[PDB]
Amino acid sequence: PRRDPFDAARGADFDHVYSGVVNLSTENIYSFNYTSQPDQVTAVRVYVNSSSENLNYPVLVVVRQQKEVLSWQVPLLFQGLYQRSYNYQEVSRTLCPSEATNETGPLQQLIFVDVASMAPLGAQYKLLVTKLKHFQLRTNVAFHFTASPSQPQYFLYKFPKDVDSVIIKVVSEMAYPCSVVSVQNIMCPVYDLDHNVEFNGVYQSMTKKAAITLQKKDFPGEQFFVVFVIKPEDYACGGSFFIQEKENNLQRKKNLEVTIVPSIKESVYVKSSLFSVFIFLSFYLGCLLVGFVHYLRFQRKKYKIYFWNIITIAVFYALPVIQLVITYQTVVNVTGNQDICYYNFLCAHPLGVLSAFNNILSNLGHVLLGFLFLLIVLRRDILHRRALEPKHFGLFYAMGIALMMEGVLSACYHVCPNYSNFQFDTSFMYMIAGLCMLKLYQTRHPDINASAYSAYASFAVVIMVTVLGVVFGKNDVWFWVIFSAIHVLASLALSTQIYYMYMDRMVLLVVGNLVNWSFALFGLIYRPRDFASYMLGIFICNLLLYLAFYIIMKLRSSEKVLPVPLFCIVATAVMWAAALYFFFQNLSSWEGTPAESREKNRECILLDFFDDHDIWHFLSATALFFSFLVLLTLDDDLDVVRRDQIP
Amino acid sequence: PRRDPFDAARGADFDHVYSGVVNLSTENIYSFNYTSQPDQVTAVRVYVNSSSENLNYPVLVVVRQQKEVLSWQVPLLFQGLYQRSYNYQEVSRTLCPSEATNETGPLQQLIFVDVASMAPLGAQYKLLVTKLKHFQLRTNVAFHFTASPSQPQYFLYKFPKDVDSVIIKVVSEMAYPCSVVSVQNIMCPVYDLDHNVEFNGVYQSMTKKAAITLQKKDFPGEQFFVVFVIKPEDYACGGSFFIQEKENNLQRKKNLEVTIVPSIKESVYVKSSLFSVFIFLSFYLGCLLVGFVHYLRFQRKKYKIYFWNIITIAVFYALPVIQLVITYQTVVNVTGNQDICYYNFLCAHPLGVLSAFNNILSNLGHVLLGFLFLLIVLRRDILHRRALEPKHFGLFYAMGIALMMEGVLSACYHVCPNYSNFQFDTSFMYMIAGLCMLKLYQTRHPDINASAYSAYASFAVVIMVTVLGVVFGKNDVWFWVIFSAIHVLASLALSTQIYYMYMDRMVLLVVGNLVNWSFALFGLIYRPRDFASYMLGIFICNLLLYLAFYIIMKLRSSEKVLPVPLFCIVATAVMWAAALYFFFQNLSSWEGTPAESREKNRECILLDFFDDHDIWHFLSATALFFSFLVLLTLDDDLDVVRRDQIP
Ligand SMILES: CCCCCCCCCCCCC/C=C\[C@@H](O)[C@H](CO)NC(=O)CCCCCCC
Ligand SMILES: CCCCCCCCCCCCC/C=C\[C@@H](O)[C@H](CO)NC(=O)CCCCCCC
Ligand SMILES: *[C@@H]1O[C@H](CO)[C@@H](O[C@@H]2O[C@H](CO)[C@@H](O)[C@H](O)[C@H]2NC(C)=O)[C@H](O)[C@H]1NC(C)=O
Ligand SMILES: *[C@@H]1O[C@H](CO)[C@@H](O[C@@H]2O[C@H](CO)[C@@H](O)[C@H](O)[C@H]2NC(C)=O)[C@H](O)[C@H]1NC(C)=O
Ligand SMILES: *[C@@H]1O[C@H](CO)[C@@H](O[C@@H]2O[C@H](CO)[C@@H](O)[C@H](O)[C@H]2NC(C)=O)[C@H](O)[C@H]1NC(C)=O
Ligand SMILES: *[C@@H]1O[C@H](CO)[C@@H](O[C@@H]2O[C@H](CO)[C@@H](O)[C@H](O)[C@H]2NC(C)=O)[C@H](O)[C@H]1NC(C)=O
Ligand SMILES: CC(C)CCC[C@@H](C)[C@H]1CC[C@H]2[C@@H]3CC=C4C[C@@H](O)CC[C@]4(C)[C@H]3CC[C@]12C
Ligand SMILES: CC(C)CCC[C@@H](C)[C@H]1CC[C@H]2[C@@H]3CC=C4C[C@@H](O)CC[C@]4(C)[C@H]3CC[C@]12C
Ligand SMILES: CC(C)CCC[C@@H](C)[C@H]1CC[C@H]2[C@@H]3CC=C4C[C@@H](O)CC[C@]4(C)[C@H]3CC[C@]12C
Ligand SMILES: CC(C)CCC[C@@H](C)[C@H]1CC[C@H]2[C@@H]3CC=C4C[C@@H](O)CC[C@]4(C)[C@H]3CC[C@]12C
Ligand SMILES: CC(C)CCC[C@@H](C)[C@H]1CC[C@H]2[C@@H]3CC=C4C[C@@H](O)CC[C@]4(C)[C@H]3CC[C@]12C
Ligand SMILES: CC(C)CCC[C@@H](C)[C@H]1CC[C@H]2[C@@H]3CC=C4C[C@@H](O)CC[C@]4(C)[C@H]3CC[C@]12C
Ligand SMILES: CC(C)CCC[C@@H](C)[C@H]1CC[C@H]2[C@@H]3CC=C4C[C@@H](O)CC[C@]4(C)[C@H]3CC[C@]12C
Ligand SMILES: CC(C)CCC[C@@H](C)[C@H]1CC[C@H]2[C@@H]3CC=C4C[C@@H](O)CC[C@]4(C)[C@H]3CC[C@]12C
Ligand SMILES: CC(C)CCC[C@@H](C)[C@H]1CC[C@H]2[C@@H]3CC=C4C[C@@H](O)CC[C@]4(C)[C@H]3CC[C@]12C
Ligand SMILES: CC(C)CCC[C@@H](C)[C@H]1CC[C@H]2[C@@H]3CC=C4C[C@@H](O)CC[C@]4(C)[C@H]3CC[C@]12C
Ligand SMILES: CC(C)CCC[C@@H](C)[C@H]1CC[C@H]2[C@@H]3CC=C4C[C@@H](O)CC[C@]4(C)[C@H]3CC[C@]12C
Ligand SMILES: CC(C)CCC[C@@H](C)[C@H]1CC[C@H]2[C@@H]3CC=C4C[C@@H](O)CC[C@]4(C)[C@H]3CC[C@]12C
Ligand SMILES: CC(C)CCC[C@@H](C)[C@H]1CC[C@H]2[C@@H]3CC=C4C[C@@H](O)CC[C@]4(C)[C@H]3CC[C@]12C
Ligand SMILES: CCCCCCCC/C=C\CCCCCCCC(=O)O
Ligand SMILES: CCCCCCCC/C=C\CCCCCCCC(=O)O
Ligand SMILES: *[C@@H]1O[C@H](CO)[C@@H](O)[C@H](O)[C@H]1NC(C)=O
Ligand SMILES: *[C@@H]1O[C@H](CO)[C@@H](O)[C@H](O)[C@H]1NC(C)=O
Ligand SMILES: *[C@@H]1O[C@H](CO)[C@@H](O)[C@H](O)[C@H]1NC(C)=O
Ligand SMILES: *[C@@H]1O[C@H](CO)[C@@H](O)[C@H](O)[C@H]1NC(C)=O
Ligand SMILES: [Ca+2]
Ligand SMILES: [Ca+2]
Ligand SMILES: [Zn+2]
Ligand SMILES: [Zn+2]
Secondary structure, eight states: OOBOHHHHOEEOOTTOEEEEEEOTTOBEEEEEEEEEOTTOOOOEEEEEEOOSSOSSSOEEEEEEOSSOEEEEEESEEEEOSSSOEEEESEEEEEEOOOOOOTTTOOEEEEEEEEEEOOOSSOEEEEEEEEEOSSOBOOTTOOEEEEEBTTBOEEEEEEOOSSOOEEEEEEEOSOOSSOEEEEEEOSSSOOOOSTTTSTTSSEEEEESSEEEEEEEGGGSTTSEEEEEEEEOSOSTTTTOOSOOOOSOOOOOOOEEEEEEEEEOOOHHHHHHHHHHHHHHHHHHHHHHHHHHHHHIIIIITOOOHHHHHHHHHHHHHHHHHHHHHHHHHHHHHHHHOBTTSSOOOGGGOOOBTTBSOSHHHHTTHHHHHHHHHHHHHHHHHHHHHHHHHOOOOHHHHHHHHHHHHHHHHHHHHHTTSOSTTTHHHHHHHHHHHHHHHHHHHHHHHOOTTTOTTSHHHHHHHHHHHHHHHHHHOSSOTTHHHHHHHHHHHHHHHHHHHHHHHOOHHHHHHHHHHHHHHHHHHHHHHHSOOSOHHHHHHHHHHHHHHHHHHHHHHHHTTTTSOOOHHHHHHHHHHHHHHHHHHHHHTOOSOOSSSOHHHHHTTOOOOOBTTTBOHHHHHHHHHHHHHHHHHHHHHTSOOGGGGSOSSOOO | OOBOHHHHOEEOOTTOEEEEEEOTTOEEEEEEEEEEOTTOOOOEEEEEEOOTTOSSSOEEEEEEOSSOEEEEEESEEEEOSSSOEEEESEEEEEEOOOOOOTTTOOEEEEEEEEEEEOOSSOEEEEEEEEEOSSOBOOTTOOEEEEEBTTBOEEEEEEOOSSOOEEEEEEEOSOOSSOEEEEEEOSSSOOOOSTTTSTTSSEEEEESSEEEEEEEGGGSTTSEEEEEEEEOSOSTTTTOOSOOOOSOOOOOOOEEEEEEEEEOOOHHHHHHHHHHHHHHHHHHHHHHHHHHHHHIIIIITOOOHHHHHHHHHHHHHHHHHHHHHHHHHHHHHHHHOBTTSSOOOGGGOOOBTTBSOSHHHHTTHHHHHHHHHHHHHHHHHHHHHHHHHOOOOHHHHHHHHHHHHHHHHHHHHHTTSOSTTTHHHHHHHHHHHHHHHHHHHHHHHOOTTTOTTSHHHHHHHHHHHHHHHHHHOSSOHHHHHHHHHHHHHHHHHHHHHHHHHOOHHHHHHHHHHHHHHHHHHHHHHHSOOSOHHHHHHHHHHHHHHHHHHHHHHHHTTTTSOOOHHHHHHHHHHHHHHHHHHHHHTOOSOOSSSOHHHHHTTOOOOOBTTTBOHHHHHHHHHHHHHHHHHHHHHTSOOGGGGSOSSOOO
16 A cells, blocks of 8 residues: 655644544645754644544544654543543643754654544544743743643753752642642653553642652753643542533643752751750750759769560560551652652651651650650669668659650651551550559559549540540541540549549639530530540640649648749740640641642741751650659658658 | 545455555555444454664554554564663554444444654565454353563453352463553453553552452443553562573563453351351360369369550550551552552452451451460469469460460451561560560569579560661671571570479480571571561470470479370370471462562362461461460379468
C-alpha cells in the first residue's frame, strides 16, 4: 500500500483554528514545521474540540514526531466508581520537548497530525496547534494556570548554579476538583495521565495546598518536569460525587498557582541546634549555681527493684516502635509516595535519611528535664538515707522515667505520623499510671477500707472505655453515649475523692463538679477525635485541679509554704497557659485524607525552623517538669515539726 | 486535506506476513475485516518486526478500530535503573475484544493498521495479524504460553454458574525474568503495560509461583481479564541487572503455565472449626474426669498485686498491636496490593474481611491451654492456703499469662505478616522473662551473695545484643562477632549456673558445654535471620537442658517421682520432637522480596485447611503446656517430709 503523506499533508500554520469533517472514507493530515535554536526550549501544544453527538463514533487523533507517536480520541471517556461514566469534549496535550545544544546546532522539526473517524455520515472537529511561550519556570516567581481532567499540564525547571535544594509550593483557592502534582526527570516520555502519573517521580495528592522538597543531587542534568493532573472524581480526596456547577457540557476546571523557592542554609541548622541545647542546659546551670550559692552562704552561716522493673518495661516497650518507624521511613524514602506520613510539609526540614529533622530535635526538652528530675529525686533520697543513718520516692522515679519515655515515644512517632502510631504513646502512659496506682494502693494498704476502692473501678471504666472506642468509631449514638458516660464517671470519681479527703468542702466539691460540666460542654462543642487522648487530658486537668484544692486548703493558715513551693506553682500556672495556647494550633491531622490534612499546613515562625508543634513540645515539657517539682516539694514547712514528720 | 484510506488500504488477509519499506514520503495502510457471532469471543493479535539499525528513526505503528486507537514504535525502548537502556525489535499486542450478544446479532468489524517512519532513506518492517484460537480459559485445565517484556499477554475467564470463588495459580520453571500477574474487569481499555498495569485490578509480582483468590460477587458480569506482564530488570524481585543469555538479539522470554481451580466449600470451614475446638476441649474433659475419679475413689478410701500488674501490662501492650494490624488489613483490602502481607497464598482461606482465617484459628490451643494451666495453679494455691489456715505461685501465674499473651500476639501477627511485626511478640517474652527473673532474685535475697549476679549480667548482655542486632544487619564481620559472643555468653552462663548448684557435676558441665558448642555449629551452618528469636530459642533449649540435669540428679535414688511427673516429662519430650519437626518447614519469609517468599508457598495437608505452620502452633502449645506441668509438679515426693517441707 503506497501512500504519500505529503500529497494531502496541508502545510499548516501555528495559532490557527482548522475546522473539518471526517468519516469512514476520509482522513485529514496536517504537517507542522518549525526550528529549534540552541540554549532554548520550545514546547508544542495540541488542542482538539468535537461535539457530543459522536458517542459511538468518536474522532481519533494521532500525532507523529521523529521518535514518538501519540494518540487519543474525542470525546474522552472516564469510568466512575459506582458504575458511572463521564465524557469530555475538549482535549489538549503538550508534546515532549527535545532541547538543542550549541554543539548540535539548530534543528529542524517536523510534526504530523492525523484526524480520522469511522462515522457513517460524518464527524465534525476543530483543531488548533500552538507554541508555549511560558514553559520554563523561574525562581521565586509565581505562575498561574488552569487544568482539566482531559487537559493535563506540565512545565520545566532548571536548577540554578548556586541553589542546592528547592521547594515547590502549589496553591488553589478552592478544592473539588482534587488533583495530583508529580515531579519527574527530563527523559521522555512524560507520564501525565490518570493511570500512569504515579509511576516514576515523587507525587502528592492535593485539594488546596501542596509542597514538595527536592535536592539537586538526585537529578542528572539539574532539571525536572512538574506535572499537574486533575481527577474525574473526588472520592480519593475526601469528596463525594463530583460537584457540578450550574454553568456545567462537562468540565471540572481547576485554577492553580505554583511557586518554586530555594531552601534554607545549614547555618540555620547550626543555630537551631545550639539554641535548643543551650535553652535547656540553662536549667542545669541555674540549679548548680543555686546549690553553690546555698553552700557558700547557708552552710557557712528498697526502691531498686521498683526502678529496674520500670527500666525493663520501658526498654522492651520502646524497641519495637523504633524498628517500625525505621521501616516506615525507609519505605517512604524508597517508594516516593508522600501520602504515607502526615508531616507539616511547609516546615519539614530534612537531614540525612530524616524527612522532618526539626520535629524530632524539638523533643530534647522532655529527655533533659526528665533526667534532671531523676537527679534531683536521687539527691533527695541519698540525703534522707544519710540523715536517717520522704516515703514515695519510687513514685517520683516513675514520674521522671515516664517523662523521659514520653519524650522518646513522641520522637519516634514524629518520624512518620499516620493513623497507626498515636496509640503507643497514648497507651504507655496508661500502663504507667495503672502500675503507679496499684503500687500506691498496696503500700497505703486497706487499713480502714481503704477509702472506697474508687480508683480501681475508675481504671476499669477506662479499660472498657478504650475498648469501646477501639470497637465503635463515631457509630451513631454510641459516640454520645460513651462521651457522656466518661464525663459522668470523671465527675463522680472526683466528687468521691474530694469527699473522702466544713463549708469549704462543699464549695470545693461544687467547683469541681462545675469544672467537670464545663469540660463536658467543651467536648460537646468539638467532637473528640480520639478517646484515649481525650481521657488522658481530662485526667491530667482533673489532677491539677485537685492539686489546686489541696494547695488552697493547706494555705488556710494551718501551715506555710516556702519560696520554692509557690515559685513552682506560679511557674506551673504560667507555663500551662502558654503551652495550652499552642496545644490548639493543629497543622495536620490523620482523621481525614492526606489532602485534607495538607490543607492545614503552615510555615514555621521561630528562627525559620520551628512551627507551633515544636513550641508545644517545649512548653509542655517545661510545664510538666514544674508541676512535678511542685508535687515533690509541696510539704517542707511541715519539716519544722520534728520526730518523724510526714513522709 | 482530503485523504481516502480505501484508495491505498490494501484489503489484507489474516495469518499472512507482509514485508515493507517506508520512509518520509511513504506510508502503508492495511485494512482487515471480520465478523463476530453471538455467544463467541474473538481476539485479534498484531505482530511487528523491525531490524535494529532503525535507532534514530524507528517505525511508528497505529491501529484504529471503531471506538479505540492504539499506537507504539519499533524497536521498543526501555530505561534502566542505573542509566542503562534496552531495545527490543519485536512487538505484539492483543486488541480489546467486544462480545456480541444474541439480541445484538452478529456484527461486522473493521480494523486499520498504519505503518510510517521518518527515515531519510528507508526503514524495513514485517507485519502479521492473526486471530487467537485459545483466548477463553477453562476450569481445572492448565494452559501454557510465553511472554516477553515487549509482548504482554492476557486472557478471559467466565465464572461458571455453580462456582462462587476461584484461585488462579501461575507457575514457571525458572525465575529471572520476573513478571507481574494482574486481574481486571471486562470493560476496556486493558492496562497491560509496565507503567499502568498496577492501577485497576489486583496484582502480584512473581518469579516462580503466584496464587490469587477471587470471589464472584466482586465482578459485574461474572468474568475477568488475567494479564501477564514481564519486566525489563530483576531489581524489584531480588535480582541484579538484566542477565544476558547466548540468545540475548535482546529478548527475555518467560514460559508460564496457568490454572484456575474452584475453591473449597463452607462444610470444610465447619469441620475445621469443630475439630479445632474439640481437640482442645478434650483436655478439659480429661482433667475433669480424672478429678472426679480421684474424688470418688481416693476421698472415699500476697500474689494479687503481682497478678494485676501483669494483667495491666498485658492489656496495655496488646491494644496498639491490634489497632495496627486492623489498619494493615484494611489497607490491603482496599488498595489491592498483595505484596504487603507475606501469607502462604496457597492455603490462605478468607472469611469476612479476613484474608487468612486458618492461620488465626490455629491459635486456639495457646489460649485454651494457658487458661487451663491458670485454673490448675489457682486450684493448687487455694488448696494450699486452706490447708495452711508452694512459694512461687506468682511465677506460674506469670507463666500462664505469658502463654495466653503469646497466643494472642501470634494471632495478631498472622493477620498481615511482614517485616514490621515479629518484634512485638519477640519482645513481650523478653519483658516477661526479665520481670520474672528480677522478682525471683529479689525474693531469694542476696543472703550469701547471692550466687554471683550472673543472671543480671546475662540479661544486660542480651540487651545490647538486641541493640546491636537492631543497629548492624549482617554487617561484614559484625555478624560473626555478635554470633560468637552470644554463643560464648550462653555457654559460660550455663557453666556458672551449673557449677554454683561429685564427678556428676563435671560430667553435666561438659555435656552442657558440648551441647552449647553443637548449637554454635548449627548456627554456623545456617545464618540466623533474626537475633532476638535466635537468642530466645537458645535460652529455651538451655532451660530444658538444665531441667534435664535437675531431673536426672533428683533420680539418683535421693528422692522419688510420682506417676504424674514422669508421664508429663515423656509427653513433653514426645511433643517437643513432633513440634520441632514442623518448626523447620518454612512456607514464607520476610527476609527477601515478596516474590522470593512466594517461591516457598505450599498447599496444606490436614483436612484441606491447615498447613505446616498451623501444626507447629498446635504442637508448640501442647509441648509448652506439658513442660509447664512438669515444672509445677516435679517436687511432690518431698511432701512426705512434713513440718514445712520444700516450698
Ligand atoms: C498518677 C501518678 C503520676 C503518673 C505520671 C504519668 C501519667 C501522667 C502524664 C505524664 C506526662 C505524659 C504527657 C501528657 C500529655 C501530652 O504529652 C499528650 C499530648 O501529646 N497528651 C495529652 O493528652 C495532652 C496533655 C493534656 C493537658 C490537659 C491540660 C493540662
Ligand atoms: C523463666 C521463667 C519462665 C518464663 C516464661 C516465659 C518465657 C519463656 C517462653 C514462653 C513461651 C513463649 C513461646 C516461645 C517460643 C515460640 O512461640 C516462638 C516461635 O514463634 N519463638 C521461638 O523462638 C521458638 C521456640 C524455640 C524452641 C527451641 C527448642 C525447644
Ligand atoms: C462521508 O462518506 C461518504 C461516502 O462514504 C463520502 O461521499 C463521497 O466522498 C468522496 C470523498 O471526499 C467525495 O469525493 C464524493 O463526492 C462523496 N460523494 C458524494 C455523493 O458527495 C463523503 O464525502 C464523506 N463525508 C465527507 C465530509 O467527506
Ligand atoms: C473549543 O471549545 C472551547 C470551549 O467551548 C473554546 O474555548 C473558547 O475560546 C474562545 C476564544 O476563541 C474564548 O473566547 C472562550 O471564552 C472559550 N470558552 C471557554 C474557555 O469556555 C475553544 O475556542 C474551542 N476551540 C478549540 C480549538 O479548542
Ligand atoms: C524514500 O523516499 C524517496 C523520496 O523521498 C522515495 O523516492 C520516490 O518515492 C516515490 C513514492 O512511491 C516513487 O514513486 C518514486 O519512484 C521514488 N523515486 C525514485 C527515484 O525511485 C522512495 O520511494 C522512498 N522509499 C520507498 C521504499 O518508497
Ligand atoms: C519476527 O522475528 C521472529 C524472531 O526473529 C520470528 O519468529 C520466528 O518465526 C518462525 C516462523 O515463521 C519460527 O520458525 C521461528 O522459530 C521463530 N523464531 C523465534 C521464535 O525466535 C518471526 O517469524 C518474525 N516475523 C514476525 C512477523 O514476527
Ligand atoms: C551535610 C550538612 C547537612 C551538614 C550540616 C551540619 C549539621 C547536619 C550538624 C551541625 C551540628 C549538628 C548537631 C550537633 C549536636 C547535636 C546534639 C546531639 O544530641 C544530636 C545531634 C545534633 C543535633 C547534631 C545534628 C547534626 C548537626 C545539626
Ligand atoms: C531539696 C529541694 C528543696 C530541692 C529543690 C530543687 C531546686 C534546687 C530547684 C527547684 C526549681 C529550680 C529552678 C527552676 C527554674 C530555674 C530558672 C532557670 O533559668 C535557672 C534555674 C532555676 C532558677 C532552677 C534552679 C533550681 C531549682 C530552684
Ligand atoms: C534516653 C535517650 C538516650 C534516648 C535517645 C533516643 C534517640 C537517640 C533515638 C530514639 C528514636 C531514634 C530514631 C528512630 C528512627 C530513625 C530512622 C532511621 O532511618 C534513622 C535514625 C532515626 C531517625 C533514629 C535516630 C535516633 C533516635 C531519635
Ligand atoms: C482483651 C482484649 C485484648 C480483647 C479485644 C477484643 C477486640 C479488639 C475485638 C473483639 C471483637 C472484634 C470485632 C469483631 C467484628 C468486627 C466487625 C468487622 O467488620 C470489623 C472488625 C470488628 C469490629 C472487630 C474488631 C476487634 C474486636 C472489637
Ligand atoms: C482531642 C483528642 C484527640 C486529644 C485531646 C483531648 C484532651 C487532652 C483535651 C480535650 C478537652 C480539653 C479540655 C477542654 C476544656 C478545658 C478548660 C480550659 O479552661 C482549659 C483547657 C481544658 C482543660 C482542655 C484541656 C485539653 C483537653 C482535656
Ligand atoms: C491551667 C489553666 C487553667 C490556666 C489558664 C489557661 C488559660 C489562660 C488558657 C486556657 C484556654 C486558652 C485559650 C484556648 C483558645 C483560644 C482561642 C485562640 O484563638 C486564641 C487563644 C485562646 C483564647 C487561648 C488563650 C489561653 C487560654 C484562655
Ligand atoms: C457466610 C458463610 C461464609 C458462613 C459459613 C459459616 C462459618 C463462617 C462459621 C460456621 C461456624 C463458625 C465458628 C463457630 C465457633 C467459633 C469459635 C469462636 O471462638 C470464634 C468464632 C468461630 C471460629 C466461628 C467462626 C465462623 C464459623 C466458622
Ligand atoms: C494437685 C496437682 C498434683 C494436680 C496436677 C494436675 C493434673 C490433674 C493434670 C496434670 C496432667 C494432666 C493430664 C495431661 C493430659 C491428659 C490427656 C488428655 O487426653 C486427657 C486428660 C489428661 C490425662 C490430663 C488430666 C489432668 C492431669 C493429670
Ligand atoms: C484472651 C482472649 C479472650 C483474647 C481473644 C482475642 C481475639 C478475639 C482477637 C485478637 C486479635 C483480633 C483480630 C485483630 C484484627 C482483626 C482485623 C479486623 O478487620 C477484623 C477482626 C480481627 C480479625 C480481630 C478478630 C478478633 C481477634 C482475633
Ligand atoms: C488514610 C490513608 C491514606 C493512610 C494510608 C496508609 C497506608 C497506605 C500505609 C500504612 C502502612 C504502610 C505499609 C507499611 C509496611 C509495608 C511493608 C513494606 O514491605 C512495603 C511498604 C508497606 C506495604 C507500607 C505501604 C504503605 C502503608 C500500607
Ligand atoms: C535506649 C535505646 C532505646 C536506644 C536505642 C538507640 C538506637 C536505636 C539508635 C542510636 C543510633 C541510631 C543510628 C544512628 C545512625 C544510623 C545511620 C543511618 O544510615 C541508618 C540509621 C542508623 C543506623 C541509626 C539507627 C538507630 C540507632 C542505632
Ligand atoms: C532463626 C530465627 C529467625 C528464629 C529461630 C532461632 C532459634 C529458635 C533456633 C535457631 C537454632 C536452633 C537450635 C539449633 C540446634 C538444636 C539442637 C537439636 O538437637 C534440637 C533443636 C535445636 C535446639 C534448635 C532449636 C531452635 C533454635 C534455637
Ligand atoms: C527436645 C529434643 C532434643 C528431643 C529430640 C528431638 C529430635 C528427635 C528432633 C530435633 C531435630 C529434629 C530434626 C530436624 C531436621 C530434620 C530434617 C528434615 O528433613 C526431617 C526431620 C528432621 C530429621 C528432624 C527430626 C526430629 C529431630 C531429630
Ligand atoms: C527523644 C529524642 C531526642 C533527640 C536528640 C537528638 C536527635 C538526634 C537524631 C539523629 C542524628 C543523626 C541521625 C540522623 C540521620 C543520620 C544520617 C547522617 O547524619 O548522615
Ligand atoms: C488468640 C486467637 C484466638 C482466636 C479465636 C477465634 C478467632 C475468631 C476471629 C473472629 C471471628 C469473627 C471475625 C472475623 C470476620 C468477621 C466478619 C463476619 O463474620 O462477617
Ligand atoms: C521546514 O521548513 C524549512 C524552512 O524553510 C524547510 O527548509 C524544510 O524543507 C521544511 N520541511 C519540509 C518537510 O518541507
Ligand atoms: C553553547 O554555545 C554558545 C555559543 O556562545 C554559548 O553561548 C552557550 O553558553 C553554550 N552552552 C552552554 C550550556 O554553555
Ligand atoms: C467486510 O466484509 C463483508 C463481507 O462480505 C462485506 O460485506 C463488507 O463490505 C466488508 N467491509 C468493507 C469495509 O469492505
Ligand atoms: C442468546 O440466544 C441464543 C439463541 O438460542 C441462545 O442459544 C443463547 O443461550 C442466548 N444467550 C444467553 C446468554 O442465554
Ligand atoms: Ca520521564
Ligand atoms: Ca479494564
Ligand atoms: Zn507531637
Ligand atoms: Zn506463627
